[PDB]
Amino acid sequence: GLFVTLEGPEGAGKSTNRDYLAERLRERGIEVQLTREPGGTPLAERIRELLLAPSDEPMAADTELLLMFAARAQHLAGVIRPALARGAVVLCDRFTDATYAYQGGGRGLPEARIAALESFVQGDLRPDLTLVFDLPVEIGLARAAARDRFEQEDRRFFEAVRQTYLQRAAQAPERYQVLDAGLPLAEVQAGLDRLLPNLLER
Ligand SMILES: Cn1c(=O)[nH]c2ncc(-c3ccccc3)cc21
Ligand SMILES: [Mg+2]
Numbered sequence: 530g531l532f533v534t535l536e537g538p539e540g541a542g543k544s545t546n547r548d549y550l551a552e553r554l555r556e557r558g559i560e561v562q563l564t565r566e567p568g569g570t571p572l573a574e575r576i577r578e579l580l581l582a583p584s585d586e587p588m589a590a591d592t593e594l595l596l597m598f599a600a601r602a603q604h605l606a607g608v609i610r611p612a613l614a615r616g617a618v619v620l621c622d623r624f625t626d627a628t629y630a631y632q633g634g635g636r637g638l639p640e641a642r643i644a645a646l647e648s649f650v651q652g653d654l655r656p657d658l659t660l661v662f663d664l665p666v667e668i669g670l671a672r673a674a675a676r677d678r679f680e681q682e683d684r685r686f687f688e689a690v691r692q693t694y695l696q697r698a699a700q701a702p703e704r705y706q707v708l709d710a711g712l713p714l715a716e717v718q719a720g721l722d723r724l725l726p727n728l729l730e731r
Contacts, residue, residue, distance in 0.1 A: 530613030531731055532654070534624040536694055537662030538687075540672025541710035542717065546662070547620050549718050553725055554618050562612040565622035567600035570607035576600040581677035588678070590636045597628055598646045605651065625651070626659055626697055631679065634693030635686045655704070657731050658724075661694050662710040 533550075535543050551561040568577035580596055601624070612619045625647050632638050666687040673680050698705035708720050 530616050531618045531728070532609065532613055532621070532657045533618060533728070534621045534626065534656040534659045535662065536623060536626045536630070536659060537710060538664055538666075538669040538673070538690075539676070540669050541662035541664045542714060543622060543662050543710075545714070546660075546708075546717060546721060547622065550721055550725075551620055553721075557729075560612075560615065560617035562608065562617045562619045563622075564604070564608050564612075564619060566604060566624055566627070567597055569600075569604040569609075569621075573600040573603045573607070576603075581679065583678050583681065590632065590638055593636065594628065594632045594638055594643065594646070597632065598650050601625070602650050605654070610654075621656075624656060624659075626656075626661075626694060629697055630690045630693040634689035635682065657704075658728060659698075659705045660721075660724075661698050661705055661707045663691065663695065663707055664710045666691055668711065 535547055537543055547563065551563060554561050566573075567580050568574040576596055576599060580593065580600075609619055609621065625643075628643050628647070629640065633640050633643050666684060669687060669691075670684065695707065698707050706720075706724055708717055710717060
């Protein structure tokens with residue numbers, strides 16, 4: 530099977546580009562399992578709700594980080610590892626890169642703390658490829674106003690999230706493809722068409 534993750538803000542066309550990529554796989558042999566984090570199983574989605582619902586009790590950062598990883602542990606067991614087991618391609622909206630970006634970059638938790646949970650929860654399992662939908666934050670912020678606890682975050686939070694994805698990509702370039710989601714969809718999908726050979730390769 531193949532484990533592909535998609536990262537970036539929702540105003541970035543992630544969803545429509547995921548559908549584009551899923552169509553290209555299904556018109557070939559390929560089983561596609563679409564999924565998203567936090568969530569993807571009934572229990573993971575209950576955890577999602579705790580994470581996204583605003584509250585008058587401020588959630589501790591260590592709490593947010595641990596809930597993200599709890600949902601991930603359930604999701605890996607309920608959905609991701611089985612998919613991969615039967616040779617499917619998983620197209621997962623957000624994964625541990627998002628933890629580095631939102632909880633590490635956004636919240637300022639130490640990368641070491643995130644890296645330690647990543648190893649505990651996932652073992653050696655990492656995405657085979659990660660698509661970063663990169664977008665200047667003003668566009669991201671406009672699109673969020675036009676459209677939860679994260680949507681309501683400030684400018685400096687979102688700047689940290691964007692640049693953390695870009696740093697993560699730069700450190701392990703064989704695992705990432707950065708896409709300029711400020712381009713019109715046609716040129717973004719052209720870019721996806723260009724990755725498909727490699728993706729089918731893996
Ligand atoms: C999967 N994931 C994570 O590990 N850390 C995360 N922080 C924020 C989001 C998220 C979820 C919904 C809307 C916006 C951001 C998702 C995250
Ligand atoms: Mg804040």
